Amino acid sequence: MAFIERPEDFLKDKENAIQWEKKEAERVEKNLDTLEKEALELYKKDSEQISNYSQTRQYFYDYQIESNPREKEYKNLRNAISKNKIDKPINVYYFESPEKFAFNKEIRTENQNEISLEKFNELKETIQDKLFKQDGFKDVSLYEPGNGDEKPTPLLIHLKLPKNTGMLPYINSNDVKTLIEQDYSIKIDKIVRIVIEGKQYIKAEASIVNSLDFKDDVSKGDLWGKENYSDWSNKLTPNELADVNDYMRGGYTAINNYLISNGPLNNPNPELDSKVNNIENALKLTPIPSNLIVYRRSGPQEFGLTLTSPEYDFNKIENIDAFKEKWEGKVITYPNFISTSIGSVNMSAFAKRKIILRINIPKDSPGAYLSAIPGYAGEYEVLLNHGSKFKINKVDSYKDGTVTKLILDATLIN
Amino acid sequence: TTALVCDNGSGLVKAGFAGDDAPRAVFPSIVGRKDSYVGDEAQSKRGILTLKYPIEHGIITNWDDMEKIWHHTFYNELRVAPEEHPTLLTEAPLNPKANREKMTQIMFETFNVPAMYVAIQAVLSLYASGRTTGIVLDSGDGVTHNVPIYEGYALPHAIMRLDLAGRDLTDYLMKILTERGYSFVTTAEREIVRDIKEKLCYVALDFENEMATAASSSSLEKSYELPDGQVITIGNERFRCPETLFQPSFIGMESAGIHETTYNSIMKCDIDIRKDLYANNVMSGGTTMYPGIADRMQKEITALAPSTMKIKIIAPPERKYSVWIGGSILASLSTFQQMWITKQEYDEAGPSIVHRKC
Ligand SMILES: *[C@H]1O[C@H](COP(=O)(O)OP(=O)(O)OC[C@H]2O[C@@H](n3cnc4c(N)ncnc43)[C@H](O)[C@@H]2O)[C@@H](O)[C@H]1O
Ligand SMILES: Nc1ncnc2c1ncn2[C@@H]1O[C@H](COP(=O)(O)OP(=O)(O)OP(=O)(O)O)[C@@H](O)[C@H]1O
Ligand SMILES: C/C1=C/C(=O)O[C@@H]2C[C@@H](CC[C@H](C)/C=C/C=C/CC1)O[C@@](O)([C@@H]1CSC(=O)N1)C2
Ligand SMILES: [Ca+2]
Numbered sequence: 001m002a003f004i005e006r007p008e009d010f011l012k013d014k015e016n017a018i019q020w021e022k023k024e025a026e027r028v029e030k031n032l033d034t035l036e037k038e039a040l041e042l043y044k045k046d047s048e049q050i051s052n053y054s055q056t057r058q059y060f061y062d063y064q065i066e067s068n069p070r071e072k073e074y075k076n077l078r079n080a081i082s083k084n085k086i087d088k089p090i091n092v093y094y095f096e097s098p099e100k101f102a103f104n105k106e107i108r109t110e111n112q113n114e115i116s117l118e119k120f121n122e123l124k125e126t127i128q129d130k131l132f133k134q135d136g137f138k139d140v141s142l143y144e145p146g147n148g149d150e151k152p153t154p155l156l157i158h159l160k161l162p163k164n165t166g167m168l169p170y171i172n173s174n175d176v177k178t179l180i181e182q183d184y185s186i187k188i189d190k191i192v193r194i195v196i197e198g199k200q201y202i203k204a205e206a207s208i209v210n211s212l213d214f215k216d217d218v219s220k221g222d223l224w225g226k227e228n229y230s231d232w233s234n235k236l237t238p239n240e241l242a243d244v245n246d247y248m249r250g251g252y253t254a255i256n257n258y259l260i261s262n263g264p265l266n267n268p269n270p271e272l273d274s275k276v277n278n279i280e281n282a283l284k285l286t287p288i289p290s291n292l293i294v295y296r297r298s299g300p301q302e303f304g305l306t307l308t309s310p311e312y313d314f315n316k317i318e319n320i321d322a323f324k325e326k327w328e329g330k331v332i333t334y335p336n337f338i339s340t341s342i343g344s345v346n347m348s349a350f351a352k353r354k355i356i357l358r359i360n361i362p363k364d365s366p367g368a369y370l371s372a373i374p375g376y377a378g379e380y381e382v383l384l385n386h387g388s389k390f391k392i393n394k395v396d397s398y399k400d401g402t403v404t405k406l407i408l409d410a411t412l413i414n
Numbered sequence: 415t416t417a418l419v420c421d422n423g424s425g426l427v428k429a430g431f432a433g434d435d436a437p438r439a440v441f442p443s444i445v446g447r448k449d450s451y452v453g454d455e456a457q458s459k460r461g462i463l464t465l466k467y468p469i470e471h472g473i474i475t476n477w478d479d480m481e482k483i484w485h486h487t488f489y490n491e492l493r494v495a496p497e498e499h500p501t502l503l504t505e506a507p508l509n510p511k512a513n514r515e516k517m518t519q520i521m522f523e524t525f526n527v528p529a530m531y532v533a534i535q536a537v538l539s540l541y542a543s544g545r546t547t548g549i550v551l552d553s554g555d556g557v558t559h560n561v562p563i564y565e566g567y568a569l570p571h572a573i574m575r576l577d578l579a580g581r582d583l584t585d586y587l588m589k590i591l592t593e594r595g596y597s598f599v600t601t602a603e604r605e606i607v608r609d610i611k612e613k614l615c616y617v618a619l620d621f622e623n624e625m626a627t628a629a630s631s632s633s634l635e636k637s638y639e640l641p642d643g644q645v646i647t648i649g650n651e652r653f654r655c656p657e658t659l660f661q662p663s664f665i666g667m668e669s670a671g672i673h674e675t676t677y678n679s680i681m682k683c684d685i686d687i688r689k690d691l692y693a694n695n696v697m698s699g700g701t702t703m704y705p706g707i708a709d710r711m712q713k714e715i716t717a718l719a720p721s722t723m724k725i726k727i728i729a730p731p732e733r734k735y736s737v738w739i740g741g742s743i744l745a746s747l748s749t750f751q752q753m754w755i756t757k758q759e760y761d762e763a764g765p766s767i768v769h770r771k772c
Pocket of ligand 2: 426471553556558611613
């Protein structure tokens with residue numbers, strides 16, 4: 001028997017979950033125009049690729065993105081999902097590959113029924129104190145898989161989705177399904193070892209952290225930046241405004257090579273020391289007013305490589321393995337000030353850079369939308385404070401033409 | 415009553431009188447650091463002094479030094495009083511607003527000019543060839559830009575920048591000649607290598623082909639006499655040097671090359687004008703002077719554009735001064751006279767009058 005209001009979590013009540021979601025599909029079908037339906041039908045036929053496109057579409061030139069015919073499907077299916085917002089939280093269930101959370105080995109083989117203790121602690125040590133960014137279309141279940149359900153990995157994600165989360169219940173052949181577009185980071189609050197049909201699984205109790213991620217929508221981003229940092233060069237003491245502009249108009253090279261070389265300890269210098277102090281407090285003036293995703297296409301020497309380093313060839317899988325082995329899960333420090341952008345799109349000036357740093361910036365971190373100053377060299381730029389530390393949560397790779405590039409999912413930990 | 419045209423670049427200032435067909439003075443955009451030193455006379459006193467370049471990548475970054483450049487321009491190069499001449503200045507594409515305002519403030523408050531104007535360099539270049547629509551590749555000593563222009567209007571959202579130009583090419587040629595077995599490293603040696611670059615380099619139509627050929631022929635080898643009389647030989651360095659423009663990775667840069675920035679710029683423009691841009695690719699600046707650059711650009715753009723596209727690269731013999739020439743024509747136009755910002759307008763509205771542009 002069912003209550004007349006749904007619960008936040010159907011748990012193992014498979015039967016009410018399915019019937020409820022079946023009625024939801026039927027209601028939601030009344031709100032979709034045929035372009036949305038067509039997009040839904042196309043999704044059933046071509047799921048993998050439509051989902052794969054939705055994960056990495058935002059990293060190309062603005063004009064390449066715009067010319068891509070897969071945009072129609074992306075935009076129309078996104079819109080279908082966005083229409084249908086839940087009016088209170090709901091918990092969902094899906095399986096995930098462990099390498100998704102940077103655990104690049106099997107928890108157990110599909111033939112093993114049990115998971116070792118050390119495996120368990122290794123997973124736990126890998127996946128906690130970490131925000132993992134998620135993107136793209138995903139099918140999720142409203143009930144915990146049980147006896148007779150498809151169970152493709154030893155890792156079950158049990159995720160709480162908040163109010164106003166877009167969700168698209170639908171029917172495919174004889175299955176009731178639920179579609180979301182991931183646009184948030186997940187926090188694994190707890191893992192526990194359970195058993196289902198005679199095998200041990202890891203169940204991850206997970207929740208969501210929201211952040212402004214403008215991706216390729218640089219106009220919306222720039223609107224957001226301008227309307228948050230317009231006042232900002234008004235609130236700078238005149239002493240700060242000069243050093244900022246000095247930095248901005250080519251001073252950054254002197255200031256940053258000073259920081260990187262430990263000048264203030266080695267061959268100290270009072271003038272540009274007051275400059276570092278002024279630029280810093282300028283960054284403390286309007287702290288980043290929401291959780292925010294920014295992007296930086298990094299030079300290879302930020303990661304101990306050169307253009308000609310054979311280990312910068314990420315088309316070779318072992319070079320990707322090696323890079324992960326070196327950097328994934330590590331914290332990383334920039335003694336210099338660093339530039340990032342609100343936009344994810346590729347650009348002429350960095351067109352060939354292979355390493356993209358995709359950074360989570362907590363609300364109130366020091367920084368500023370410098371591109372609220374008319375005509376600044378940096379495209380949609382956010383400047384972060386000297387000595388910033390970034391935890392590298394996860395390394396992904398994608399294909400830009402024939403070239404393999406990396407996306408470093410990272411978090412500003414101050 | 416004769417207007418002045420001052421085209422201030424990263425490496426060179428080109429200056430003269432509106433109505434003339436060439437600048438009367440062209441001198442280095444350097445300051446020695448009126449006891450302080452500028453222009454040609456600052457090079458030989460370096461010194462208890464080294465040379466400073468106040469314009470970096472097309473942008474004025476030191477205003478004190480820039481006042482000295484401009485003082486030197488009026489008094490020593492042109493030998494005029496600034497109070498007696500309307501002065502047309504040039505600026506880089508996307509020059510910050512505050513920068514424009516500061517140029518205006520200095521002209522009126524420091525130099526007391528009766529009138530002035532700031533023009534976009536790429537636009538003047540385009541005007542010099544009698545055009546108002548086209549995409550300009552402007553490559554000098556310090557910066558290179560693509561600037562698409564439609565009926566006299568620069569389209570700023572489609573402007574592509576590269577901080578790679580003549581000086582990087584000179585410096586690269588120093589390195590690869592040094593790898594050949596010579597030694598080119600000092601500031602004086604950099605001038606010599608610049609001269610070698612200007613006299614003997616060229617852009618290969620097919621780079622990999624031309625590298626294969628280099629190991630075979632010596633019809634590509636050329637010689638050059640140093641000031642002390644040593645005659646040196648230069649081979650594949652002739653075309654590897656400017657190849658950097660199309661392959662910025664040669665100097666460790668991960669930016670798009672100039673064919674790709676040209677294409678990117680066109681793709682950021684309205685679909686309806688793109689054929690106008692493809693058919694009016696105009697080159698200006700000293701770093702577009704390489705024999706073979708136009709043919710190579712033709713071929714590279716052809717590889718990127720639709721097979722049905724009509725592509726034309728316009729590279730006038732005068733293109734090393736087409737910005738200046740464009741300013742000279744402009745400042746002489748009857749319809750331009752209403753556009754000068756007068757001293758009275760500055761008094762009335764302050765530096766921000768440059769954006770209204772009178
Ligand atoms: C358009 O292009 C330029 C400059 O772009 P960048 O943001 O790459 O310039 P940076 O100053 O950030 O890069 C300087 C070079 O030094 C390397 N780097 C930077 N920080 C470090 C650290 N901390 N450690 C080792 N290397 C570092 C970078 O890889 C880069 O090569 C500008 O005009 C834009 O508008
Ligand atoms: N024949 C030539 N071949 C190749 N390069 C040349 C030639 N003549 C001049 N150059 C180079 O062109 C550059 C100067 O050109 P130009 O005066 O247009 O630049 P600028 O205006 O000083 O700099 P920018 O426009 O980058 O601010 C120098 O680097 C010079 O070596
Ligand atoms: C004929 C000529 C052309 C020129 O463009 O000079 C400009 C200006 C010059 C200033 C420094 C020297 C010492 C003083 C020189 C007086 C020079 C007139 C030189 O520095 C450049 O040489 C740099 C270095 S090497 C290069 O590629 N750009 C560009
Ligand atoms: Ca110039």
